[PDB]
Coordinates of C-alpha atoms in Angstrom, one line a residue:
X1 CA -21.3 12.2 9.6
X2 CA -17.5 12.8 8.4
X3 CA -15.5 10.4 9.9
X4 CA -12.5 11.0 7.4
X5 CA -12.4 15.3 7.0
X6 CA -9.9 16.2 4.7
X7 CA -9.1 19.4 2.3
X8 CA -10.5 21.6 5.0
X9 CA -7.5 22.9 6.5
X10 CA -4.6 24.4 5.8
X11 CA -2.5 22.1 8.2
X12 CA -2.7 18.6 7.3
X13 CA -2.9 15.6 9.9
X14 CA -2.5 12.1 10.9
X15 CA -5.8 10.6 11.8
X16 CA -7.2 7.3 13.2
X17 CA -8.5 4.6 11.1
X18 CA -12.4 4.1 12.1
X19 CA -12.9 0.7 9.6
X20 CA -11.3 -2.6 9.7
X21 CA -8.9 -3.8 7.5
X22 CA -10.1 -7.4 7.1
X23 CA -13.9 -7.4 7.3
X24 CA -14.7 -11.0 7.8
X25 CA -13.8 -13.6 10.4
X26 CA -11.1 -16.0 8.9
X27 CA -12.4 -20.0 8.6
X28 CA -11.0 -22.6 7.0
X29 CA -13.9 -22.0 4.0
X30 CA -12.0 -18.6 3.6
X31 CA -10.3 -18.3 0.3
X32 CA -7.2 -17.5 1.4
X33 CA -5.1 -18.6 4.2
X34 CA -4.7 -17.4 8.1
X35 CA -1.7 -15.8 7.5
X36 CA -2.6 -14.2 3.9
X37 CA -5.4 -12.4 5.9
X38 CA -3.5 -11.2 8.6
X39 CA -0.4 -9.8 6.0
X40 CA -3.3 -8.0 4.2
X41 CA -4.4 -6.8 7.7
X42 CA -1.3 -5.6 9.0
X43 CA 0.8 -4.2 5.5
X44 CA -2.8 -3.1 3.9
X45 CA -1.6 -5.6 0.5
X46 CA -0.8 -9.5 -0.7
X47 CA 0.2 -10.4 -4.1
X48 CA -1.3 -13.4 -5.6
X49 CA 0.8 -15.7 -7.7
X50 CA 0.1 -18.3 -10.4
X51 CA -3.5 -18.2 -10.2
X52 CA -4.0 -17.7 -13.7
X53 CA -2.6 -20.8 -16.5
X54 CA -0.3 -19.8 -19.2
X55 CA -3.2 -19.9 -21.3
X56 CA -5.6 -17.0 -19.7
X57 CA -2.4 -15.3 -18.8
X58 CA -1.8 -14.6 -22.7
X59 CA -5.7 -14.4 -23.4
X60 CA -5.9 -11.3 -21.3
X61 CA -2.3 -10.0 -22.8
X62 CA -4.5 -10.5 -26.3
X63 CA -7.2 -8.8 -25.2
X64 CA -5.7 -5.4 -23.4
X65 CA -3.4 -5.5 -26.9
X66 CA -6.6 -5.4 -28.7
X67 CA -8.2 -2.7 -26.4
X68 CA -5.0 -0.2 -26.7
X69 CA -4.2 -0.6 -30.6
X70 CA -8.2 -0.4 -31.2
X71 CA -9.6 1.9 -29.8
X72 CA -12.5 2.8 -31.7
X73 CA -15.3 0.4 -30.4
X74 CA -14.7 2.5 -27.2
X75 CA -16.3 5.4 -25.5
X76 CA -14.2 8.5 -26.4
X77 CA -15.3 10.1 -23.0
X78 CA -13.1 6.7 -20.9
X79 CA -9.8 7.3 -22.9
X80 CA -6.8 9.4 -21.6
X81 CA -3.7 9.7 -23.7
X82 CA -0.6 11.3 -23.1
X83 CA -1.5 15.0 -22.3
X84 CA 0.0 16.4 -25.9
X85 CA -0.9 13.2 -27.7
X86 CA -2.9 10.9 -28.7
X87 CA -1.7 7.9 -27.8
X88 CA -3.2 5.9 -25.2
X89 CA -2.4 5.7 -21.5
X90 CA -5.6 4.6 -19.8
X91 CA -8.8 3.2 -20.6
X92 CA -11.3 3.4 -17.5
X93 CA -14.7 0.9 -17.5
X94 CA -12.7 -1.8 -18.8
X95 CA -15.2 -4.1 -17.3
X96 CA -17.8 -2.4 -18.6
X97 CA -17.0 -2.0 -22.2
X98 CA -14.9 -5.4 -22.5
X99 CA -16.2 -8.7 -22.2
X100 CA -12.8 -10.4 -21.6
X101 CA -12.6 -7.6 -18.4
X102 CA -15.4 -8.2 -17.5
X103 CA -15.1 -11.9 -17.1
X104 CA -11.9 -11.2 -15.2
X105 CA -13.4 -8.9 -12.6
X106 CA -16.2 -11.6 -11.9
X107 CA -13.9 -14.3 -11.7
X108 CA -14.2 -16.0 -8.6
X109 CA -10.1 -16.1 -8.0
X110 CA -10.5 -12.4 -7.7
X111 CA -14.6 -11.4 -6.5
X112 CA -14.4 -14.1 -3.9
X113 CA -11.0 -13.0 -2.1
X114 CA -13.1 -9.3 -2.3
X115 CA -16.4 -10.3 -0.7
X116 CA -14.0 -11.8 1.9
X117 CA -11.5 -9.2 2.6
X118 CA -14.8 -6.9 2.8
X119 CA -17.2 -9.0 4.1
X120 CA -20.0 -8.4 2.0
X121 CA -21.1 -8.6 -1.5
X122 CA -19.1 -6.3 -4.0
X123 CA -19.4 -3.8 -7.2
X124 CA -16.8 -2.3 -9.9
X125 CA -16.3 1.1 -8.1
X126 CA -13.7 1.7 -11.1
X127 CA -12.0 0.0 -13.5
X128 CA -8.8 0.9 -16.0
X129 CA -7.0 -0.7 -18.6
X130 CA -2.9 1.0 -17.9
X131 CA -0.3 0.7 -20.1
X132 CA 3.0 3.1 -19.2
X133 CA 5.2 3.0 -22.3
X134 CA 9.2 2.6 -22.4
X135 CA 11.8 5.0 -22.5
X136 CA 9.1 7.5 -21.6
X137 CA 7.2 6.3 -18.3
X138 CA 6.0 8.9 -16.2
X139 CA 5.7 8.3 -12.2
X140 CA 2.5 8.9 -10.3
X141 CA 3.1 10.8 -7.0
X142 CA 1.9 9.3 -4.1
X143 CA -1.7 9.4 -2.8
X144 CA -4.0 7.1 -1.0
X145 CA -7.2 6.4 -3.5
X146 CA -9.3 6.8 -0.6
X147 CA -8.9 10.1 0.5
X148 CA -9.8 10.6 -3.3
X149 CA -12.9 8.7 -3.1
X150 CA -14.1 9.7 0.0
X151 CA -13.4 13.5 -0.8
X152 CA -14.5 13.6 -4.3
X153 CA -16.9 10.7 -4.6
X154 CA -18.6 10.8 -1.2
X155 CA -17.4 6.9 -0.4
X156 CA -18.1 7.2 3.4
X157 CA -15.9 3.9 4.3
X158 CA -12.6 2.2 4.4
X159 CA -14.2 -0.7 2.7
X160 CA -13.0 -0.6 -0.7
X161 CA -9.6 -2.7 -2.7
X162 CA -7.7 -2.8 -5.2
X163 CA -6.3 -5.4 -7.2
X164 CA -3.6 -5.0 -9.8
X165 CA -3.0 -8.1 -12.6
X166 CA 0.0 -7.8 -14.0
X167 CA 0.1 -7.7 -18.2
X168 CA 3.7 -6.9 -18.6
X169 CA 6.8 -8.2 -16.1
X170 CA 7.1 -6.0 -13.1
X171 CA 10.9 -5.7 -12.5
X172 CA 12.7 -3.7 -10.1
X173 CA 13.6 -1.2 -12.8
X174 CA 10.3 0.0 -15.0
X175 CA 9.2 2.0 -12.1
X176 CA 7.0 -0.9 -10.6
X177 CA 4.1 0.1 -7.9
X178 CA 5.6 1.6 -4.7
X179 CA 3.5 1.1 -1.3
X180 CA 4.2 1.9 2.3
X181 CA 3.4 -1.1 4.3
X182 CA 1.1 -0.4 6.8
X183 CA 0.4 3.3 5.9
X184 CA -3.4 2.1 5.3
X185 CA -4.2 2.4 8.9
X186 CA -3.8 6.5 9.0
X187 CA -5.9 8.5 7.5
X188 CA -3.3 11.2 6.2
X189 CA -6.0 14.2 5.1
X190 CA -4.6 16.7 2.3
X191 CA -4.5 20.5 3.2
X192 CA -5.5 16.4 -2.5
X193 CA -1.5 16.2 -2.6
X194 CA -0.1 14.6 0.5
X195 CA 2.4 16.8 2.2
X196 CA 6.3 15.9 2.5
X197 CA 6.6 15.3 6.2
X198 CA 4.0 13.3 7.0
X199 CA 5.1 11.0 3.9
X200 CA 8.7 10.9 5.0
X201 CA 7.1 10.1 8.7
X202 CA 5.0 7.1 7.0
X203 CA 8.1 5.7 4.8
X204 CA 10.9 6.6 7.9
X205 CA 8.1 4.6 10.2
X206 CA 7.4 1.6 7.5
X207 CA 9.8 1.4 4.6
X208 CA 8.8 0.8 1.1
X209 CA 8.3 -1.8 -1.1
X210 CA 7.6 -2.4 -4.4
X211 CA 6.1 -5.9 -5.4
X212 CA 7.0 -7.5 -8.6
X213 CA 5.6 -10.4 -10.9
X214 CA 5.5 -11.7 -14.4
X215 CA 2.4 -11.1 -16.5
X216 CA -0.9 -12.6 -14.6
X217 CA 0.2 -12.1 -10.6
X218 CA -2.3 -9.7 -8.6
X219 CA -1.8 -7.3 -6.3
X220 CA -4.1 -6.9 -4.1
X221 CA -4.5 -3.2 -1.9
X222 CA -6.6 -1.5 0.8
X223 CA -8.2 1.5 -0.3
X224 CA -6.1 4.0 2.0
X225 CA -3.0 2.4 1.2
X226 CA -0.7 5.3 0.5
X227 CA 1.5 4.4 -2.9
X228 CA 3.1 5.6 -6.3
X229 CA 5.4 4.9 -8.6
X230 CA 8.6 6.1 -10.3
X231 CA 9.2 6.7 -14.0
X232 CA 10.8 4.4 -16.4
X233 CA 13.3 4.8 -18.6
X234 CA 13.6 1.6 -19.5
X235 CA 12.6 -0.3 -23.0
X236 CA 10.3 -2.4 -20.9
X237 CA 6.7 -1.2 -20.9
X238 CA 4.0 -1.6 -17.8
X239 CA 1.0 -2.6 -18.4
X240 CA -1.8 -3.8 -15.5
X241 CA -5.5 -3.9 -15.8
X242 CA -6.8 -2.3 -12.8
X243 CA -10.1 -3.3 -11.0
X244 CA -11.6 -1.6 -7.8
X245 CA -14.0 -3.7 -5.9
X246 CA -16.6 -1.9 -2.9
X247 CA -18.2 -3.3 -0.8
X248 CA -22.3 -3.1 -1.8
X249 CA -23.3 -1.6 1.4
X250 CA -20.6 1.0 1.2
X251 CA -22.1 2.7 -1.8
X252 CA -21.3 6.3 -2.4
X253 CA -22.7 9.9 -0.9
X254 CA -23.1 12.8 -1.5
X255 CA -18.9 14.0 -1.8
X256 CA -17.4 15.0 1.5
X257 CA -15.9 18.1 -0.7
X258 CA -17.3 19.8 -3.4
X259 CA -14.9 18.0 -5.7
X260 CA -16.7 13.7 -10.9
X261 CA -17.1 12.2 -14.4
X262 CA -19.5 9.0 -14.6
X263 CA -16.4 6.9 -15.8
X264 CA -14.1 7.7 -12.5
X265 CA -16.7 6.4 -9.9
X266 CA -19.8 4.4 -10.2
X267 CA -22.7 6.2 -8.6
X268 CA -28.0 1.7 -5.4
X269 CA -25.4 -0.5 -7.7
X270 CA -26.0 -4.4 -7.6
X271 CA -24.3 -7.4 -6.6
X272 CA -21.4 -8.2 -8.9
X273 CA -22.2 -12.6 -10.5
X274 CA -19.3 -14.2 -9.6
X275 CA -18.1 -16.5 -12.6
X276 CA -15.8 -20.1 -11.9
X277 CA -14.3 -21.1 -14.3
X278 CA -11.6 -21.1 -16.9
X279 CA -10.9 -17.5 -18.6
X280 CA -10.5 -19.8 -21.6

Protein backbone atom coordinates (compact mmCIF):
# COMPACT_ATOMS: atom_id res chain seq x y z
CA UNK A 1 0.00 0.00 0.00
CA UNK A 2 3.14 2.53 0.75
CA UNK A 3 5.86 1.34 -0.90
CA UNK A 4 7.86 4.75 -0.54
CA UNK A 5 6.96 5.91 3.53
CA UNK A 6 8.40 9.00 4.31
CA UNK A 7 7.77 12.06 6.89
CA UNK A 8 6.85 9.47 9.48
CA UNK A 9 9.88 9.22 11.47
CA UNK A 10 12.11 11.20 13.11
CA UNK A 11 15.27 9.24 11.70
CA UNK A 12 15.44 9.41 8.06
CA UNK A 13 16.65 6.42 5.75
CA UNK A 14 17.97 5.06 2.67
CA UNK A 15 15.42 2.88 0.95
CA UNK A 16 15.23 0.54 -2.14
CA UNK A 17 13.94 1.62 -5.35
CA UNK A 18 10.63 -0.69 -6.10
CA UNK A 19 10.14 0.97 -10.00
CA UNK A 20 12.28 0.81 -12.99
CA UNK A 21 14.13 3.45 -14.31
CA UNK A 22 13.57 2.85 -18.04
CA UNK A 23 10.11 1.40 -18.55
CA UNK A 24 10.21 0.08 -21.95
CA UNK A 25 12.33 -2.49 -23.83
CA UNK A 26 14.91 -0.63 -26.13
CA UNK A 27 14.35 -1.38 -30.18
CA UNK A 28 15.68 0.08 -32.85
CA UNK A 29 11.98 2.00 -33.35
CA UNK A 30 12.91 3.61 -29.85
CA UNK A 31 13.48 7.23 -30.07
CA UNK A 32 16.56 7.40 -28.63
CA UNK A 33 19.57 5.33 -28.90
CA UNK A 34 20.81 2.05 -26.85
CA UNK A 35 23.17 3.91 -24.96
CA UNK A 36 20.95 7.17 -24.33
CA UNK A 37 18.51 4.66 -22.50
CA UNK A 38 20.86 3.01 -20.52
CA UNK A 39 22.76 6.66 -19.32
CA UNK A 40 19.14 7.69 -18.40
CA UNK A 41 18.97 4.32 -16.56
CA UNK A 42 21.98 4.25 -14.74
CA UNK A 43 22.60 8.51 -13.86
CA UNK A 44 18.58 8.92 -13.68
CA UNK A 45 19.13 12.08 -16.69
CA UNK A 46 20.28 12.77 -20.55
CA UNK A 47 20.38 16.11 -22.04
CA UNK A 48 19.15 16.57 -25.49
CA UNK A 49 20.82 18.82 -27.88
CA UNK A 50 19.97 20.62 -31.10
CA UNK A 51 16.57 19.29 -31.45
CA UNK A 52 15.04 22.41 -31.80
CA UNK A 53 16.06 24.96 -35.22
CA UNK A 54 17.21 28.47 -34.53
CA UNK A 55 13.87 29.39 -35.49
CA UNK A 56 11.57 27.64 -32.63
CA UNK A 57 14.47 28.07 -30.36
CA UNK A 58 13.69 32.02 -30.52
CA UNK A 59 9.79 31.37 -30.94
CA UNK A 60 9.66 29.91 -27.55
CA UNK A 61 12.28 32.74 -26.11
CA UNK A 62 9.26 35.19 -27.64
CA UNK A 63 6.78 33.47 -26.13
CA UNK A 64 8.07 32.91 -22.24
CA UNK A 65 9.21 36.90 -22.85
CA UNK A 66 5.61 37.49 -23.51
CA UNK A 67 4.34 35.28 -20.59
CA UNK A 68 6.69 37.00 -17.90
CA UNK A 69 6.33 40.85 -18.97
CA UNK A 70 2.37 40.13 -19.43
CA UNK A 71 1.06 38.80 -17.09
CA UNK A 72 -2.35 39.72 -17.10
CA UNK A 73 -4.12 37.17 -19.40
CA UNK A 74 -3.01 34.75 -16.61
CA UNK A 75 -4.60 33.07 -13.69
CA UNK A 76 -3.43 35.16 -10.64
CA UNK A 77 -3.77 31.95 -8.42
CA UNK A 78 -0.42 30.17 -11.01
CA UNK A 79 1.88 33.22 -10.43
CA UNK A 80 4.65 33.33 -7.69
CA UNK A 81 6.87 36.39 -7.52
CA UNK A 82 9.62 37.15 -5.35
CA UNK A 83 8.36 36.69 -1.74
CA UNK A 84 8.35 40.79 -0.99
CA UNK A 85 7.64 41.60 -4.56
CA UNK A 86 5.88 41.50 -7.33
CA UNK A 87 7.87 40.56 -9.81
CA UNK A 88 7.68 37.27 -11.36
CA UNK A 89 9.52 34.05 -10.64
CA UNK A 90 7.30 31.24 -11.75
CA UNK A 91 4.36 30.68 -13.72
CA UNK A 92 2.89 27.04 -13.20
CA UNK A 93 0.25 25.53 -16.06
CA UNK A 94 2.23 26.93 -18.69
CA UNK A 95 0.77 24.30 -20.87
CA UNK A 96 -2.41 24.89 -19.87
CA UNK A 97 -2.74 28.62 -20.18
CA UNK A 98 -0.24 28.99 -23.31
CA UNK A 99 -0.71 27.69 -26.60
CA UNK A 100 3.01 28.01 -27.62
CA UNK A 101 3.58 25.54 -24.22
CA UNK A 102 1.36 23.69 -24.95
CA UNK A 103 2.48 22.84 -28.35
CA UNK A 104 5.95 22.23 -26.89
CA UNK A 105 4.81 19.71 -24.31
CA UNK A 106 2.98 17.67 -27.04
CA UNK A 107 5.72 17.81 -29.35
CA UNK A 108 6.71 14.53 -30.38
CA UNK A 109 10.69 15.38 -29.81
CA UNK A 110 9.67 15.55 -26.15
CA UNK A 111 6.06 13.30 -25.54
CA UNK A 112 7.53 10.46 -27.54
CA UNK A 113 11.06 10.18 -25.57
CA UNK A 114 8.32 10.24 -22.39
CA UNK A 115 5.85 7.46 -23.42
CA UNK A 116 9.17 5.63 -23.96
CA UNK A 117 11.22 6.25 -21.00
CA UNK A 118 7.76 5.30 -19.17
CA UNK A 119 6.34 2.91 -21.16
CA UNK A 120 2.97 4.05 -21.41
CA UNK A 121 0.88 6.94 -22.54
CA UNK A 122 1.62 10.24 -20.60
CA UNK A 123 -0.12 13.52 -18.97
CA UNK A 124 1.22 17.19 -17.77
CA UNK A 125 1.49 16.20 -13.96
CA UNK A 126 2.95 20.00 -13.78
CA UNK A 127 4.07 22.51 -15.65
CA UNK A 128 6.18 26.03 -14.94
CA UNK A 129 7.43 28.80 -16.85
CA UNK A 130 11.10 29.80 -14.49
CA UNK A 131 12.87 32.66 -14.89
CA UNK A 132 15.81 33.36 -11.97
CA UNK A 133 16.95 36.99 -12.48
CA UNK A 134 20.74 38.27 -12.36
CA UNK A 135 22.62 39.65 -9.69
CA UNK A 136 19.95 38.32 -7.46
CA UNK A 137 19.32 34.46 -8.16
CA UNK A 138 18.40 32.53 -5.28
CA UNK A 139 19.41 28.63 -5.08
CA UNK A 140 16.84 25.90 -4.50
CA UNK A 141 18.02 23.36 -1.85
CA UNK A 142 18.10 19.96 -2.77
CA UNK A 143 15.11 17.61 -2.90
CA UNK A 144 13.93 14.76 -5.00
CA UNK A 145 10.39 15.94 -6.65
CA UNK A 146 9.19 12.63 -5.88
CA UNK A 147 9.26 12.24 -2.44
CA UNK A 148 7.20 15.55 -2.90
CA UNK A 149 4.76 14.01 -5.11
CA UNK A 150 4.38 10.90 -3.64
CA UNK A 151 3.99 12.53 -0.05
CA UNK A 152 1.93 15.39 -0.81
CA UNK A 153 0.16 14.40 -4.02
CA UNK A 154 -0.42 10.75 -3.39
CA UNK A 155 1.72 9.75 -6.87
CA UNK A 156 2.12 5.97 -5.84
CA UNK A 157 5.11 5.30 -8.52
CA UNK A 158 8.57 6.11 -9.74
CA UNK A 159 7.03 6.65 -13.04
CA UNK A 160 7.17 10.25 -13.56
CA UNK A 161 10.16 12.84 -15.64
CA UNK A 162 11.15 15.81 -16.01
CA UNK A 163 12.42 17.72 -18.78
CA UNK A 164 14.06 21.09 -18.57
CA UNK A 165 14.38 23.39 -22.15
CA UNK A 166 16.72 25.74 -21.79
CA UNK A 167 15.47 29.61 -22.56
CA UNK A 168 18.55 31.31 -21.38
CA UNK A 169 22.49 29.88 -21.74
CA UNK A 170 23.27 27.52 -18.88
CA UNK A 171 26.92 28.32 -17.96
CA UNK A 172 28.90 26.99 -15.30
CA UNK A 173 28.43 30.21 -13.30
CA UNK A 174 24.54 31.33 -13.12
CA UNK A 175 23.97 28.69 -10.65
CA UNK A 176 22.89 25.99 -13.42
CA UNK A 177 20.80 22.67 -12.25
CA UNK A 178 22.90 20.50 -9.94
CA UNK A 179 22.08 16.61 -9.93
CA UNK A 180 23.64 13.57 -8.20
CA UNK A 181 24.05 10.97 -10.76
CA UNK A 182 22.58 7.99 -9.89
CA UNK A 183 20.88 9.25 -6.65
CA UNK A 184 17.35 8.32 -8.38
CA UNK A 185 17.70 4.76 -7.46
CA UNK A 186 17.30 5.47 -3.34
CA UNK A 187 14.49 6.52 -2.08
CA UNK A 188 15.94 9.04 0.63
CA UNK A 189 12.60 9.67 2.90
CA UNK A 190 12.51 13.12 4.85
CA UNK A 191 12.14 12.96 8.80
CA UNK A 192 10.30 17.25 3.45
CA UNK A 193 14.03 18.63 3.78
CA UNK A 194 16.62 15.90 3.10
CA UNK A 195 19.00 15.57 5.90
CA UNK A 196 22.95 16.41 5.58
CA UNK A 197 24.44 13.05 5.88
CA UNK A 198 22.62 11.05 3.81
CA UNK A 199 23.14 13.95 1.01
CA UNK A 200 26.89 14.12 1.64
CA UNK A 201 26.68 10.04 1.50
CA UNK A 202 24.80 10.42 -2.06
CA UNK A 203 27.32 13.25 -3.51
CA UNK A 204 30.67 11.44 -1.63
CA UNK A 205 29.16 8.06 -3.39
CA UNK A 206 28.24 9.77 -6.94
CA UNK A 207 29.70 13.23 -7.44
CA UNK A 208 27.76 16.11 -8.93
CA UNK A 209 27.13 17.54 -12.01
CA UNK A 210 25.63 20.20 -13.46
CA UNK A 211 24.61 20.03 -17.23
CA UNK A 212 24.76 23.11 -19.33
CA UNK A 213 23.37 24.26 -22.85
CA UNK A 214 22.42 27.29 -24.93
CA UNK A 215 18.86 28.26 -25.21
CA UNK A 216 16.64 25.13 -26.68
CA UNK A 217 18.72 21.90 -25.10
CA UNK A 218 16.51 19.57 -22.68
CA UNK A 219 17.26 18.05 -19.81
CA UNK A 220 15.65 15.25 -19.24
CA UNK A 221 15.25 13.75 -15.27
CA UNK A 222 13.80 10.79 -13.29
CA UNK A 223 11.33 11.74 -10.82
CA UNK A 224 13.58 10.76 -7.63
CA UNK A 225 16.48 12.28 -8.90
CA UNK A 226 17.84 14.20 -5.96
CA UNK A 227 19.08 17.92 -7.33
CA UNK A 228 19.25 21.83 -6.71
CA UNK A 229 20.88 24.63 -7.63
CA UNK A 230 23.14 27.43 -6.37
CA UNK A 231 22.47 31.17 -6.56
CA UNK A 232 23.65 33.62 -9.05
CA UNK A 233 25.23 36.45 -8.85
CA UNK A 234 25.87 36.90 -12.14
CA UNK A 235 24.29 39.55 -14.81
CA UNK A 236 23.14 36.42 -16.66
CA UNK A 237 19.55 35.41 -16.00
CA UNK A 238 18.06 31.54 -16.10
CA UNK A 239 15.32 30.98 -17.55
CA UNK A 240 13.82 27.20 -18.51
CA UNK A 241 10.27 26.16 -19.10
CA UNK A 242 9.67 23.25 -17.06
CA UNK A 243 7.31 20.27 -18.09
CA UNK A 244 6.53 17.06 -15.88
CA UNK A 245 5.22 14.21 -17.86
CA UNK A 246 3.40 10.84 -15.78
CA UNK A 247 2.80 8.10 -16.94
CA UNK A 248 -1.37 7.71 -17.51
CA UNK A 249 -1.64 4.64 -15.42
CA UNK A 250 0.36 6.21 -12.59
CA UNK A 251 -2.27 8.75 -11.81
CA UNK A 252 -2.41 10.18 -8.32
CA UNK A 253 -4.02 8.87 -4.71
CA UNK A 254 -5.07 9.84 -2.16
CA UNK A 255 -1.49 11.73 -0.49
CA UNK A 256 0.71 9.35 1.43
CA UNK A 257 0.83 12.36 4.15
CA UNK A 258 -1.66 14.66 5.03
CA UNK A 259 0.29 17.25 3.03
CA UNK A 260 -2.13 20.83 -2.50
CA UNK A 261 -3.31 23.63 -4.75
CA UNK A 262 -4.96 22.49 -8.25
CA UNK A 263 -2.06 24.29 -10.07
CA UNK A 264 0.98 22.20 -8.32
CA UNK A 265 -0.43 18.66 -9.27
CA UNK A 266 -3.02 17.54 -11.68
CA UNK A 267 -5.61 15.42 -10.04
CA UNK A 268 -8.73 9.93 -14.35
CA UNK A 269 -6.49 12.57 -16.69
CA UNK A 270 -6.26 11.65 -20.46
CA UNK A 271 -3.77 10.76 -22.93
CA UNK A 272 -1.70 13.75 -23.82
CA UNK A 273 -2.03 14.24 -28.51
CA UNK A 274 1.26 14.08 -29.53
CA UNK A 275 1.90 16.87 -32.20
CA UNK A 276 4.95 16.42 -35.26
CA UNK A 277 5.86 19.00 -36.56
CA UNK A 278 7.59 22.26 -36.72
CA UNK A 279 7.00 24.73 -33.59
CA UNK A 280 6.98 27.22 -36.42
Amino acid sequence: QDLYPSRQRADAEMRPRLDPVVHSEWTNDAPISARQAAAFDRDGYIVLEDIFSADEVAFLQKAAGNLLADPAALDADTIVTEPQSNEIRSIFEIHAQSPVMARLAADARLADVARFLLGDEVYIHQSRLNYKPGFKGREFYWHSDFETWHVEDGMPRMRALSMSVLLAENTPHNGPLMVIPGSHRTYLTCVGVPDEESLAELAHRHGIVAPTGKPGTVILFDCNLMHGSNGNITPFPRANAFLVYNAVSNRLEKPFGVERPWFLARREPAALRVERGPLV
